[PDB]
C-alpha cells in the first residue's frame, strides 16, 4: 500500500530480518477469484 | 550543511523524502499521474491552451525537410550528393504530404499531424511512440505506414509485477537499453479482454520497428514524465477555486432583498412587492415595472443586502498563480493567460525571445529527432526499392552509414515577426555585412534558399518575356 | 509525488478513471454536442468566437493554386503549367457558379460550404462531406457535395458500440474508417429516423464520403469540440451575469420606503401626493420637486441601494480571459475590450492569434478544400474536359496526390499599421530574400493574374497616351 | 567585535562549529540531494530553474572548434588545419548519430548528454560520466559514455567513512581521488544491492571515469547543489501557497448563513427556495432573485468573506527575489515577471544573468565536453581513422592536452531587440576591433563553414544568373 501497487496480479517481495540471526524471506502475494460471466453457458456431464 | 539537516527550530523536522531513482519514484503511480494529466488537459482550459501553444510554436503549421548528407565523410562528389538530395527531397515532398493521407495506418493523419500529435503526447505524457511497419498492399509505391501509440498501451503484460529487465512491459538488457515493448490493444468497450503483444524496437535488418522518443532526466530512466507533474495540484485546486468563486458570486448576487413582515408570505408579497392577479408553494412572481415604492407598517421592514465585492483580490491572486503555473510549464505568462497589458516593448521582447528559445530547444530535441528517425526508416525502404539512385563510387554502403545518408535538418514555423520592420532591417544588414547566408535567413523565416532562388529566377524570366519590368536581380 | 496523494491529503479522493479518448468521449458524445449547440446558439461570446473563426480561418474568399509535380511525373514544365492554367480556369469558373448547384441543397457556394465545415468542426470537433453524382447531365460536371451534421452519423437502431462498430462508424482492425451510418432529418420528431450505410471510399478510387477531424489519441473515431474545456465556466459566466443583472434591476427598482400607522391609501395621498381624486393602489404624477409633512410615527426614507458593479467587471475580465485562453482566440478579439493596450503588445497578441489561425486553416480548410478539388478533378479528367500530358509516366488515379497537388490562398493578415508592413514587404522584395508570389499570397492575391492585370493596365495607359505606369521599358 | 557576542546578547547562542565543508556536508549528503530531487520533481519553480539553466548554458546546439597548439607542437599551420577539419568532420558525423549509439542506453545525443549532465550537476553539485569499450563491430568506434547519478556512487554497504574512503570515494594521501565504488540500479527494491569499484584513470592514460564539480575549498570531494541555501524557504513558500489556496477556497465556499428555530428542511423550503416536495440536504435551483420572507427570529446573514490576496503578491515578490539571489538567476526570468521595468533595466538583468551563465558554461559544460572529446579522440587515434602529422615533435600521450586543445560554442545571447546589437557588431568589424569568427561564434556559428556556405551560395547565384550577393570579386 505504501508503494501504491495494491492492485496487481502477483506481488513478489524479498525482505530481510534485522538482528544477529538475520535472514531473508521471500513472499508471493495473490488474491485470485477467477469467475465466468455466463455461469449457465457451459454444460458438465458426469458419465456412467 | 545546515539547511538540509533539520530546519530552523525544528521547522521541517518531518521532511524525509525517500531518496531513490526516478523509476522507483514514478513507476508505481505512473498510470495515475498520466491519467490526472489527461484529465487536466481535457477539462482545464489553461492546460488545453498550453498544449495548443506547444503544438503551434514547437513546429507550427509546416515542417520542411532538408537533406544534408555527409558527402565529405562518405567521400562523395558534391554534385552527386546534391543530385541525390534533390531526388530524395522530390520523393519526400510528393510522398509525405500526399492527399492519399496513407502515411498512417489510421488513414486520417498527415505528416505534420504525426509530428504535432507526437509532440503533444510527449508534452502531456513525457514520451511518444510510433510504430513504423510494412504493409502488404502493393497499391502504393511505398509499403510503410506509421501509427502513434499512447503510452497507456505500453504496459506490463497481464498487469503483473515488474523485474530488473521488465518495467511496465519494457524489456531492457544488462546495460539497460530497451529492446522490446509489450503493447496492449485498445479496450473500448471495457467489456472485451485487453491483450498484449511484444514488439522489438528494430528489425534484424536494422529497420527501426518501434520508435520511442522522450527526454530522460537521470541515468536509468525508462519512461518519460509529463512536465505537468509539479503543477497538478495547483491546477486542480485553482479550477476548484474558480468554480467555488463562481458559485459564491452567483448566490450572493442572487439574494438581493428580504422582507421582515409578521404576516404570511403571500400577504407580505402582495402588500410589499405586488404581483397577485394570477391566472390559476411557488408564492407569486412580481412583474418588473418601475419604482413602485411600497408602504410599510411597524414591525415590518425591507432590507436590501449590499453583498460585497465579487472579485475581492481573486483576480490578482489568480494572476499570481498563473505566473506560477506559467513558470512551471516553461511558457510565457502573457501568452498563457492572454494578459498582454501594461507591458513595455522591451519586456514583451524579452519574454517572447526566451519562450521562443525554449520552444526551439524543445523542437530540436523532440520533433527533429522523431522526424529524422521516421525519415530514415522511410529512406531505407526507398533505397530498398531503388526509387533513388545511390552514387556508384560510394566509399560506404547504407548499412554502415544510416546516419550519414540520413543526415538531415528540419525547419518548422520561422521566427515570428514581433515587429517585422526591425527584424527585416537586421536581416538585410546581416546580408550586406556578409555575416549570414540566404539559407540561414530563409530557415529563420521558415523557408529554404534553393527553391526560393528557383522561384525568383522563374518570375524574372516570366516578367522578362512579358516585357513589363525586370525585378531587383539582374546580371 | 505531486500526483500521488496531495500535500496533507488534498486530492486524496480524486483519481480519474484512465481510459482511451473514445471511452472518455463517446458515452456522452450526443449530449456534449447538444450542449455545445445550446451554448453557441444562446451565448453571445460563443457566437462571437465562431464568427472570428469563420472570418480568420478562411476569410471571405479562397483561391486555388494547383502545382502538379511535373518533375516527379516526368512532365515538361511548359505543358504542366498550361494544364495547370486550364484546370485553374475551369475550377474558378465552376466553383463560384451562380447556379449555386455545387451542392444539391442549392443554398451555398464553395466558400460558404468551407465555412460551414469549419464552423461545425470547431463547435463539434469534426466535419462530414458526401460527394454524389447528380443524375442530370445538363451541367458539364455532375458532381455535387453535401455537408452532414456530426449528429447525423450514429449507430443504426441505437445498437451499442462494438470493437469495429463505434457510433455508426464501421472500421477495420487497424482502425481506419470503412463505412458510415447516416440518418435522414428528424423534423418533426415523430417519423422514423431510418439509416443508410455509405462506404467511405468507393472502390473506383473516388472518395464517396470524407470525414475530417483533428484526433488527440489513437483510435479516436470522432472529434471533440474545443468547447469541452470551457463548457461549465462559460455557462456559469452567463448565469452569473444574468443573475447580477436581475439583482441590479431589483435593487434599483426599489428606491424609497414609507411607513405610517394610518391607512395606506391616505398615507400615500398625504406623503407621495397621489391622484386620490380619481389593486391599482395610487400611481402618482411626476411634477416638480416636492416636500411633504409628516407627524411623528410616520417616516419616509429613501434607500441608498448598492453599487451595481462591485468588482463584477473585474470578475468578468478574468472569466473572459480564461474563456479566450480555452478557445485559443485572443482576449481582445473575443471581448472587444481593447483598452489599456500598447502597439507592441497588441501586435504580439494578434501575431500569436494569427499563427494559431493559420495552423488551423492549413489543418482543416486547406485539407478539405484539396479533397473536394481532387474529387471534382476526377470527374473532370474522366469527362476529358481537360487533358493530361501524353508523356504522363503515371496515370491520374495512380498519382492523384501528385496530379492534384494544390495549396490555397485565404484572407491576408490585415496589419494594424500597414505602413510598416508594406515598407517591410518592399524592402524584402528589393533585398531578394522573398518573392512576388510569396508576398502576393500573403496579402491575398496571386502574382500571375496580378502581372496579367499590370500588362492590361500599361496597355490601356499607352493606348490612352497619358502616362506609362511604374513598370515599362 | 561584531562577531564576539552581539548587541545585548542576541546571538549569545549562535556559535556554529568551525570544520571543513566535507565534515559539515557528508553526514547529511544523502538528505540534501534527496530534498533537492523532491523539490526539482514536485516544484514548479525548481523545474523552471533547471530548464532555464540547461536551455541557457547549452540550448538546442553545442558545437566544437578544434584548435590544436601547432606552434607548440612544431607543426605546419596548413597541416594543423587539415587535421582539425578532418577530425571535425569525423566528430560531427559521429556525434549526431540518430541511434544515440554514443550512449550505451541509446536514447540521448551529445547535446542531450551535456544538458542532462549540467542539470544533474546543478541539482546535485556534481556529474559523473564513464567511458566503456564495447565489443560491437557495427560501428567504427567502440567507446561509449554512461551517466552516473550521485546516488549510485556511495560507500559500499553503507560502510563507515574513513580517512581515504569517503562516501565510496577512495582518495590518495595527498587529496586526489583515484577510485569510486558505484552501486547498481535501485529498482525494484527487492534485488540485492551490488557495488562495483572503478578507477578514475586507466593505466594506459585514458580517462575511464570523469567526475566534474567545482569545489569551494581544499579537501572537497563532492559538490554542493545550488539549493543548499534556498530549499527551506522554497518548501515553506510552497506550504504557504498551499494553505493560502485552501483558505481562499473555504472563504469562497462559505458565503451565506441561515438562522432559524424552524426545522432545517422547512427553513430551507421557506427561505432558500428548496425542492423538498420532490444525504446532501436538498439541492437549490439557481434561478431568479428569490426574495424571501423570513419571520422574526430568523437571519439571512451574507458573509462578506475576505480579500483573497492580502499582500501575498508582494510576499511572492520578496521571496522570489530572495530565491533568485540564492540561485544566481534573475528574478524576471525566474518568475516570468517583467512588469514596471524599463529597457535599460531589463538589459542590465539579462547582462548579469548571461555573464553568470557564460561562466557556468565554461566551468562545467566546456570542461566536461573537452574531457569526453579527448576520450573519443584517443580512441580515434588508436583506431587510425585519422593520421597524425609526421613532423609531430611529441607523442600523443605527451601532448594530449596540446593535441586535444579545443573550445565550444553553445546558444548565443539572443538580445532584446537584435537590430542595435547587430549594427554595433557590424561597426565593430568595420573598425577592426572584433573579428569574424568571434562574432559568428557569439551568434552561434563558425566562420569557416559560414564562408564555405557563402561561396556555395554565390556560385549558385552565378549559375542561376540573377545577381551576385554581398561577397564578390
Short mmCIF file of C-alpha atoms in Angstrom, two decimals, chain A:
data_model
loop_
_atom_site.label_atom_id
_atom_site.label_comp_id
_atom_site.label_asym_id
_atom_site.label_seq_id
_atom_site.Cartn_x
_atom_site.Cartn_y
_atom_site.Cartn_z
CA UNK A 1 0.00 0.00 0.00
CA UNK A 2 2.84 2.40 0.81
CA UNK A 3 4.32 1.78 -2.64
CA UNK A 4 0.84 2.06 -4.16
CA UNK A 5 0.86 -1.24 -6.05
CA UNK A 6 -2.10 -2.69 -4.16
CA UNK A 7 -3.77 -3.65 -7.46
CA UNK A 8 -1.68 -6.36 -9.11
CA UNK A 9 -1.96 -9.93 -10.35
CA UNK A 10 1.09 -11.15 -8.42
CA UNK A 11 3.24 -9.46 -5.83
CA UNK A 12 6.83 -10.59 -5.17
CA UNK A 13 8.69 -9.48 -2.07
CA UNK A 14 12.17 -10.40 -0.85
CA UNK A 15 12.84 -8.89 2.57
CA UNK A 16 15.49 -9.31 5.24
CA UNK A 17 15.10 -9.51 9.01
CA UNK A 18 17.38 -7.47 11.25
CA UNK A 19 19.37 -8.71 14.24
CA UNK A 20 22.20 -11.20 14.52
CA UNK A 21 20.21 -14.18 13.16
CA UNK A 22 19.47 -12.05 10.11
CA UNK A 23 17.86 -13.95 7.25
CA UNK A 24 15.99 -13.36 4.01
CA UNK A 25 12.35 -14.24 3.39
CA UNK A 26 10.58 -14.47 0.04
CA UNK A 27 6.87 -13.94 -0.47
CA UNK A 28 4.36 -14.06 -3.30
CA UNK A 29 1.06 -12.29 -2.67
CA UNK A 30 -2.07 -13.01 -4.67
CA UNK A 31 -5.85 -12.68 -4.48
CA UNK A 32 -7.34 -14.76 -7.29
CA UNK A 33 -11.11 -15.09 -7.70
CA UNK A 34 -11.43 -16.16 -11.35
CA UNK A 35 -15.06 -16.38 -12.50
CA UNK A 36 -17.21 -16.62 -15.61
CA UNK A 37 -19.74 -14.02 -16.73
CA UNK A 38 -22.03 -16.75 -18.15
CA UNK A 39 -22.43 -19.44 -15.48
CA UNK A 40 -25.03 -21.47 -17.38
CA UNK A 41 -23.26 -21.39 -20.75
CA UNK A 42 -21.07 -24.43 -20.13
CA UNK A 43 -22.57 -27.86 -19.54
CA UNK A 44 -20.92 -30.60 -17.48
CA UNK A 45 -21.99 -34.23 -17.90
CA UNK A 46 -20.81 -36.90 -15.48
CA UNK A 47 -20.59 -40.17 -17.38
CA UNK A 48 -21.79 -43.65 -16.47
#
